[PDB]
Amino acid sequence: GPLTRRASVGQYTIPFAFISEVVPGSPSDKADIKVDDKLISIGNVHAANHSKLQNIQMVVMKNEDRPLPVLLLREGQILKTSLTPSRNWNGRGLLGCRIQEL
């Protein structure tokens, strides 16, 4: 994550899962998610409240066809993207990636 800087004039950070596979053409692929990304948040689900991942399947089903915010750690950088869970692609389920706990 970012190094500490002095406060200046002018957010989840804790990884909890990782992405081990991404099906080409899936919603996860379209969201620019990559193998080995670490998941920091998906919708309202983050390290403190994912309930051993069960809250993810619920959140993605409820958000079918609607964009969800995703925070991930890639190569040490926190990236913000969005994923639209959907069935309309050539594969199984709403996501097309495998998400496992760290």
From Swiss-Prot:
Domain PDZ: 11-78
Protein family (similarity comment): Belongs to the proteasome subunit p27 family.
Subunit-structure text: Part of a transient complex containing NAS2, RPT4 and RPT5 formed during the assembly of the 26S proteasome.
Other comments on record: Present with 846 molecules/cell in log phase SD medium.
Role description: Acts as a chaperone during the assembly of the 26S proteasome, specifically of the base subcomplex of the 19S regulatory complex (RC). During the base subcomplex assembly is part of a NAS2:RPT4:RPT5 module; NAS2 is released during the further base assembly process.
Protein name according to UniProt: Probable 26S proteasome regulatory subunit p27
